[PDB]
JSON list of C-alpha atoms in Angstrom, two decimals:
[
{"chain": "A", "resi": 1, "resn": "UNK", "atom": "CA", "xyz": [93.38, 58.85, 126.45]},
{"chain": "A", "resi": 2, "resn": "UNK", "atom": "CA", "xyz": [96.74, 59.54, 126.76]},
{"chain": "A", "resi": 3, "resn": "UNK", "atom": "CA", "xyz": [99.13, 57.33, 125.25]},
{"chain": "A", "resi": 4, "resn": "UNK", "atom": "CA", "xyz": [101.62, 58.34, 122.52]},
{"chain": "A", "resi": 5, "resn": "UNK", "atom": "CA", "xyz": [102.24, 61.81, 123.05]},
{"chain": "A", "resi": 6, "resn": "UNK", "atom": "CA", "xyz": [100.28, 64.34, 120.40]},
{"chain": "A", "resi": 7, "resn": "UNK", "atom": "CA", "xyz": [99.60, 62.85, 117.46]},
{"chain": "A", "resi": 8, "resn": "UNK", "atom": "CA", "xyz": [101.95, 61.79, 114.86]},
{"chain": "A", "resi": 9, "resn": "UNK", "atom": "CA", "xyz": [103.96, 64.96, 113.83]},
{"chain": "A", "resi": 10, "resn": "UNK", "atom": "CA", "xyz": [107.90, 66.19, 113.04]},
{"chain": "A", "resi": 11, "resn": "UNK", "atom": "CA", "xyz": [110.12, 66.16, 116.04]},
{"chain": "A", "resi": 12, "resn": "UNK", "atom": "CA", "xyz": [112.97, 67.75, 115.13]},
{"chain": "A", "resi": 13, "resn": "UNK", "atom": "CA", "xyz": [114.34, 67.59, 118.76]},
{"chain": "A", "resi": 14, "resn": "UNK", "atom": "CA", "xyz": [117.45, 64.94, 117.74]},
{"chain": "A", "resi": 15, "resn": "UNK", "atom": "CA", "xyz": [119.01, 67.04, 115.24]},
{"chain": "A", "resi": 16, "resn": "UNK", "atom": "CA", "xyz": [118.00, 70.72, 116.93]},
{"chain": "A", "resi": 17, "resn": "UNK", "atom": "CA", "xyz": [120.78, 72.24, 116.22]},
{"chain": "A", "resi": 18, "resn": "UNK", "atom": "CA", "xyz": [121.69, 70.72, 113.12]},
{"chain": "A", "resi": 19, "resn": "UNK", "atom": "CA", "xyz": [118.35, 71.76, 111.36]},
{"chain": "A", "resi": 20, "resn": "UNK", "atom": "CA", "xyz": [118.35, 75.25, 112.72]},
{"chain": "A", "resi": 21, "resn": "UNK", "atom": "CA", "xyz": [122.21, 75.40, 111.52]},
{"chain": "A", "resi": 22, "resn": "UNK", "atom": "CA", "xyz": [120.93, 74.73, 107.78]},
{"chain": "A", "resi": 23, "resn": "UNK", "atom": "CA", "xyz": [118.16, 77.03, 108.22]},
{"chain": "A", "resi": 24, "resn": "UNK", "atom": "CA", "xyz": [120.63, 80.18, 109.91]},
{"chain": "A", "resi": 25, "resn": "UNK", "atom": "CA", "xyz": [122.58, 79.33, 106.47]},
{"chain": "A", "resi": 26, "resn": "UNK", "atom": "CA", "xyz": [120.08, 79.67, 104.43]},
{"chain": "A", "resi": 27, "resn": "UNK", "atom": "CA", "xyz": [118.95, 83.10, 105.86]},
{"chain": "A", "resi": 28, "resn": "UNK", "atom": "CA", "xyz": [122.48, 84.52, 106.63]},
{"chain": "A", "resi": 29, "resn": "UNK", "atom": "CA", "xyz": [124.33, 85.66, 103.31]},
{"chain": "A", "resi": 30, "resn": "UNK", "atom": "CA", "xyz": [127.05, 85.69, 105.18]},
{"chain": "A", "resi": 31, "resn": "UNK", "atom": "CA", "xyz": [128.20, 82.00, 104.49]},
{"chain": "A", "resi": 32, "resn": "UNK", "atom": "CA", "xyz": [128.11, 80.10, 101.51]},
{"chain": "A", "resi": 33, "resn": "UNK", "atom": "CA", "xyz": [124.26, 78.98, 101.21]},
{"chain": "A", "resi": 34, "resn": "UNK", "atom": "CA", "xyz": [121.41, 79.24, 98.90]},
{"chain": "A", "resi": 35, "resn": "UNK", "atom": "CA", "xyz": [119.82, 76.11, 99.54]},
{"chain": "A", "resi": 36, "resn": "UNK", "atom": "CA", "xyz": [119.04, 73.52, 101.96]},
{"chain": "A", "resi": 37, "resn": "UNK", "atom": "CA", "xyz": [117.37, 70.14, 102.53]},
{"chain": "A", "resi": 38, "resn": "UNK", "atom": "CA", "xyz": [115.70, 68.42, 105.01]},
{"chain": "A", "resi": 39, "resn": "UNK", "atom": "CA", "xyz": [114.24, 64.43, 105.16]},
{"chain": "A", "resi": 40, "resn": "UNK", "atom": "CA", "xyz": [113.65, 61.96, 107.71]},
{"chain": "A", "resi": 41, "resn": "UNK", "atom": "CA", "xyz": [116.35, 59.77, 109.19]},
{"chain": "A", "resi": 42, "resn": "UNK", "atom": "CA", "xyz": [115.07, 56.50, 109.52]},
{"chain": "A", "resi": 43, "resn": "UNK", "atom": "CA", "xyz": [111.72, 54.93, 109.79]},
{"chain": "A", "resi": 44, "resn": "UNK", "atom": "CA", "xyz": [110.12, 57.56, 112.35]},
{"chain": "A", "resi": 45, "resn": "UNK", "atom": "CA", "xyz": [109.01, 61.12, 112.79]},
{"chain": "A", "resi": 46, "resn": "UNK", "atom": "CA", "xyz": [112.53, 63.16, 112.96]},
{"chain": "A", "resi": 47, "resn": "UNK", "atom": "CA", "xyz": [113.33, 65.79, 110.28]},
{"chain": "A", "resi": 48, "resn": "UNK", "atom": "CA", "xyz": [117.26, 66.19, 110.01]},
{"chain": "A", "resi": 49, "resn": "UNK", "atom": "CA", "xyz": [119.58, 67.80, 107.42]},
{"chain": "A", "resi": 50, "resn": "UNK", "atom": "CA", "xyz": [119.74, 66.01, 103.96]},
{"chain": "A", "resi": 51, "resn": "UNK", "atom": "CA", "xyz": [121.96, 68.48, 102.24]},
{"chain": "A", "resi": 52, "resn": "UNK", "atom": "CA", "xyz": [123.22, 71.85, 101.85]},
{"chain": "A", "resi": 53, "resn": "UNK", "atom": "CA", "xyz": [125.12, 74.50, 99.29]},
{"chain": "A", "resi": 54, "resn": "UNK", "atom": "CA", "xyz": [125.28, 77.43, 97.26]},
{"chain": "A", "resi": 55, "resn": "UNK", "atom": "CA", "xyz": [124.66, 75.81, 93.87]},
{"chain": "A", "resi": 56, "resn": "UNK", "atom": "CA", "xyz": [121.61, 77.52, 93.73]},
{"chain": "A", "resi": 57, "resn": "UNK", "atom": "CA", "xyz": [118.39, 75.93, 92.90]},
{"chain": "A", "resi": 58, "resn": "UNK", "atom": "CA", "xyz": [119.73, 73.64, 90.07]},
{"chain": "A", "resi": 59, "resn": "UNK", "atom": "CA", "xyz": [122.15, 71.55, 92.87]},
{"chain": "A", "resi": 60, "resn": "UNK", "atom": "CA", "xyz": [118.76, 71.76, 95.16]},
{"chain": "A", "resi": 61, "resn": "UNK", "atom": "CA", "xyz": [116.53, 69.91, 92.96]},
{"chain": "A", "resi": 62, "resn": "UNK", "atom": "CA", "xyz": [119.55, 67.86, 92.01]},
{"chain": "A", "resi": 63, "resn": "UNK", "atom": "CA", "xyz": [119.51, 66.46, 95.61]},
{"chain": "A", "resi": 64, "resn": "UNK", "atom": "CA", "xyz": [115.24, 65.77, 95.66]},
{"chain": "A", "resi": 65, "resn": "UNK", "atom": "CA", "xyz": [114.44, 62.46, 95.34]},
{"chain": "A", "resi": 66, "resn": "UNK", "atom": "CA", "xyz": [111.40, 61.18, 93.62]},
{"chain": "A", "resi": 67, "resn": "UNK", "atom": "CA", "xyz": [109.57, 58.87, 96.45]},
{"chain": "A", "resi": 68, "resn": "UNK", "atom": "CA", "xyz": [110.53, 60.59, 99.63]},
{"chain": "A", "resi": 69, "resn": "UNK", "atom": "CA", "xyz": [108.72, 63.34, 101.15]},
{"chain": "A", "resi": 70, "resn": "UNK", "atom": "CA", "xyz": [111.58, 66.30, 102.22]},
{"chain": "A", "resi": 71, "resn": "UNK", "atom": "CA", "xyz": [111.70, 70.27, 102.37]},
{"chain": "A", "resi": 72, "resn": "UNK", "atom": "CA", "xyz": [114.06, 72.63, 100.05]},
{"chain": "A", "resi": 73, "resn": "UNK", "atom": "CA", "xyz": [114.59, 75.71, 101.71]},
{"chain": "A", "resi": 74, "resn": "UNK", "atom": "CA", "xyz": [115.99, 78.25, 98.81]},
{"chain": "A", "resi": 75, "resn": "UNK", "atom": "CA", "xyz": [117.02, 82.16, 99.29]},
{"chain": "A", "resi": 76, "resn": "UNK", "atom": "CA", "xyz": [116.61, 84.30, 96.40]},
{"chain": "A", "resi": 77, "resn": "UNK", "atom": "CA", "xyz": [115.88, 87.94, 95.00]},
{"chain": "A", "resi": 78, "resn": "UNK", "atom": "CA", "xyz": [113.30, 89.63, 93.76]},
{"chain": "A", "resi": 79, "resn": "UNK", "atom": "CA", "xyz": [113.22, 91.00, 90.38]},
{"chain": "A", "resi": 80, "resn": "UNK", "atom": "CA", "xyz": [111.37, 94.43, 91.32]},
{"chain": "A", "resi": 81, "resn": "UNK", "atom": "CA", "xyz": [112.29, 94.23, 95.08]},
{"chain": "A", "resi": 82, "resn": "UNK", "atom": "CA", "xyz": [115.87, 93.07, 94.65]},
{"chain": "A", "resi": 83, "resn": "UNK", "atom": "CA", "xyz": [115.67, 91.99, 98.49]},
{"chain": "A", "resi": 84, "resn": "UNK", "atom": "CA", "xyz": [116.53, 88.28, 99.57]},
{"chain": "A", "resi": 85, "resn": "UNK", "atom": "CA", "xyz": [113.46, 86.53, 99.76]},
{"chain": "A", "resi": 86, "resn": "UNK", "atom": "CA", "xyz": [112.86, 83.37, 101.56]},
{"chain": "A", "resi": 87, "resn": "UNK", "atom": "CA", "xyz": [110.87, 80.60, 99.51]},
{"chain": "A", "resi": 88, "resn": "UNK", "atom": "CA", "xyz": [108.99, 77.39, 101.08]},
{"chain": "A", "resi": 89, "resn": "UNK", "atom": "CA", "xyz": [108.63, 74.30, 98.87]},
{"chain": "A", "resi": 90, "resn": "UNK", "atom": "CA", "xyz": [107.01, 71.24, 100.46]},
{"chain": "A", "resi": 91, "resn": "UNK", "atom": "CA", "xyz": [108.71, 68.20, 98.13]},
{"chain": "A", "resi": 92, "resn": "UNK", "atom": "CA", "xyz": [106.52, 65.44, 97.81]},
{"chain": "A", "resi": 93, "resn": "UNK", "atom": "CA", "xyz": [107.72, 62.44, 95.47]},
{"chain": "A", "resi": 94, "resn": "UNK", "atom": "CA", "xyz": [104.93, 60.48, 93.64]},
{"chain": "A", "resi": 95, "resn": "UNK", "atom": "CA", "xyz": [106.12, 57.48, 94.18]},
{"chain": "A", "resi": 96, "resn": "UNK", "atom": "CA", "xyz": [104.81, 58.03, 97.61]},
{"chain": "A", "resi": 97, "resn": "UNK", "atom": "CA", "xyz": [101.76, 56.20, 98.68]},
{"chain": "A", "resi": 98, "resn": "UNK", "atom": "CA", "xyz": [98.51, 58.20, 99.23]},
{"chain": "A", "resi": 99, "resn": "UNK", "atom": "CA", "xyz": [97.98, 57.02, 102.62]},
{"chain": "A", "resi": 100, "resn": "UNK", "atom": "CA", "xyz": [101.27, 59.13, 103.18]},
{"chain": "A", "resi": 101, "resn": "UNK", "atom": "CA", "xyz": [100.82, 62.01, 101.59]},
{"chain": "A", "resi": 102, "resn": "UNK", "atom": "CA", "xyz": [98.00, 62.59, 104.07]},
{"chain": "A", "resi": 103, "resn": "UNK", "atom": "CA", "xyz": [100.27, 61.27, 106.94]},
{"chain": "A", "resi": 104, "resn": "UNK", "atom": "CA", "xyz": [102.69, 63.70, 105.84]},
{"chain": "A", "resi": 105, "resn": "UNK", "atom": "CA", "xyz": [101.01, 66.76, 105.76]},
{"chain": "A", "resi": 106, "resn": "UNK", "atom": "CA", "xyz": [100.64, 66.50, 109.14]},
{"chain": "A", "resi": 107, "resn": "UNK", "atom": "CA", "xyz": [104.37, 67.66, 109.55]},
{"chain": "A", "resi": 108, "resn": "UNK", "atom": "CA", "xyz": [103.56, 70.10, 107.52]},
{"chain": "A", "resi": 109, "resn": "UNK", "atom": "CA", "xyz": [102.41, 72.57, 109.82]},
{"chain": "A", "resi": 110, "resn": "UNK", "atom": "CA", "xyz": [105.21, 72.01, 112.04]},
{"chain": "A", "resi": 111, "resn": "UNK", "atom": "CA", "xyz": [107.88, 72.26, 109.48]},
{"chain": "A", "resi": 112, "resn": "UNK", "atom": "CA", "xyz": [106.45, 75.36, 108.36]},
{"chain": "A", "resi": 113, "resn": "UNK", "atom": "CA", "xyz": [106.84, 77.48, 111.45]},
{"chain": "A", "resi": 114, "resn": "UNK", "atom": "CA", "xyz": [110.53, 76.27, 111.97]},
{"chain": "A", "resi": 115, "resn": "UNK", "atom": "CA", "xyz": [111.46, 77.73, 108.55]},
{"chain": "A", "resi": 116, "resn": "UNK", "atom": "CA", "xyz": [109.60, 80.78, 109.17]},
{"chain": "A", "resi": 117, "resn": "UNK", "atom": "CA", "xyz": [110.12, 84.08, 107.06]},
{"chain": "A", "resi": 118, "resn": "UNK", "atom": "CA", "xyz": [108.59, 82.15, 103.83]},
{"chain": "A", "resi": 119, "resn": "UNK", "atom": "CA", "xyz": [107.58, 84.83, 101.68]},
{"chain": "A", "resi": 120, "resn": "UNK", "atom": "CA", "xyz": [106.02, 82.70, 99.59]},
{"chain": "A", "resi": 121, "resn": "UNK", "atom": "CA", "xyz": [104.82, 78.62, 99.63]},
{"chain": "A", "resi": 122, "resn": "UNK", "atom": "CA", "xyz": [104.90, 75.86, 96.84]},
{"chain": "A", "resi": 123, "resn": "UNK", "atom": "CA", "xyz": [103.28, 72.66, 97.05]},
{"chain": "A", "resi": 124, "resn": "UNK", "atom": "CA", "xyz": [105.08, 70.52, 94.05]},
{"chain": "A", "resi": 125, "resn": "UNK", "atom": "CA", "xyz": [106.16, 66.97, 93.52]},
{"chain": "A", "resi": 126, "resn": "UNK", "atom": "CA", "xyz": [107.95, 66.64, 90.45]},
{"chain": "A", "resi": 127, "resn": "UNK", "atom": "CA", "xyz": [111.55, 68.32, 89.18]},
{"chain": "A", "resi": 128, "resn": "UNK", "atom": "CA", "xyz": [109.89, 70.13, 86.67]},
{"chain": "A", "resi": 129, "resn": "UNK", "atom": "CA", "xyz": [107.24, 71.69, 89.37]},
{"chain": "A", "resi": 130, "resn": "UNK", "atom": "CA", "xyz": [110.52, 72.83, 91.26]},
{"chain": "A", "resi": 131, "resn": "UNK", "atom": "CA", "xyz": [112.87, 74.38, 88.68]},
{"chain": "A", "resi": 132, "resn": "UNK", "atom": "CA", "xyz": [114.61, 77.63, 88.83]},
{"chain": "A", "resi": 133, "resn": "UNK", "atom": "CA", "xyz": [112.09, 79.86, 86.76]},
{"chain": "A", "resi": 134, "resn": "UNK", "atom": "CA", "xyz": [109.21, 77.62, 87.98]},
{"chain": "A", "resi": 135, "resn": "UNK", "atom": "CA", "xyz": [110.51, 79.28, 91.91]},
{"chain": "A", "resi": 136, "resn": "UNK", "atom": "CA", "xyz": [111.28, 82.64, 90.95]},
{"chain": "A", "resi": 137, "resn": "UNK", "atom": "CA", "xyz": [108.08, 83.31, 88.51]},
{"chain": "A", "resi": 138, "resn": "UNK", "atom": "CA", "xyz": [106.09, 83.03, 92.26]},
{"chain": "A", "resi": 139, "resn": "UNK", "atom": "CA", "xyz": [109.01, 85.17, 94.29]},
{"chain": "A", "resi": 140, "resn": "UNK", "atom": "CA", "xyz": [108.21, 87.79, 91.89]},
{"chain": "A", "resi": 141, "resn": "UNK", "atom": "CA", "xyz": [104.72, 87.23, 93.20]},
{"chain": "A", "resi": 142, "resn": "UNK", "atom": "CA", "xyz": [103.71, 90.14, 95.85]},
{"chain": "A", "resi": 143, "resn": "UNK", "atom": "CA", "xyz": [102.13, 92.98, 97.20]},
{"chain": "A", "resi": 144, "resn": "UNK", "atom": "CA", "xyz": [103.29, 95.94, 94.48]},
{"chain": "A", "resi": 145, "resn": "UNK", "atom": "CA", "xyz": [99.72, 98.26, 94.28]},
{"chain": "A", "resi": 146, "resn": "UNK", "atom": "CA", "xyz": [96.10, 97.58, 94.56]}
]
């Protein structure tokens, strides 16, 4: 029974470092970082580093490409709160296939625990399901009273 390995998932073994750098970024206001992307490198299961800057989250969805599957990390803060709050969106062009989608979502679950600290997750696929008050209007989003 044992022949490939798991089962199809994100390795994220080639670029260790590289990812985790983007992600330390992200999370440390330290440097210059409010946003980072991740996407494949060629035709196989490896996430690696796509882009990354403190343009906020208009130079992030500037950088998403409609028909690739990839992963914005953005750090912003609350409006009550005022704390920096880690969000999660999971950016999945249409022009991808629906045999992939399901494929993809596979990864998934192992993307999400690398960027842990998510306070909050978004499943989109277009720009507009992406934008900066489309992001924040769910950071807002949390535990407050009853």
């Amino acid at each position: 029974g044992s022949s490939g390995s798991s089962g199809m998932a994100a390795n994220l073994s080639r670029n260790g470092p590289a990812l985790q750098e983007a992600y330390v970024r992200v999370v440390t206001e330290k440097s210059p970082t409010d946003w980072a992307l991740f996407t494949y490198e060629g035709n196989s299961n490896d996430i690696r580093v796509a882009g990354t800057g403190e343009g906020g989250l208009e130079e992030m969805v500037e950088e998403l490409n409609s028909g690739k599957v990839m992963y914005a990390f953005c750090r912003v803060k609350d409006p009550n709160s005022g704390l920096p709050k880690f969000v999660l969106i999971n950016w999945t062009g249409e022009g991808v296939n629906d045999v992939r989608k399901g494929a993809c979502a596979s990864h998934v679950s192992t993307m999400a625990s690398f960027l842990k600290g998510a306070h909050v997750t978004i499943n989109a696929r277009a720009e507009e399901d992406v934008e900066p008050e489309c992001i924040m209007e769910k950071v807002a989003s949390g535990p407050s009273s009853g």
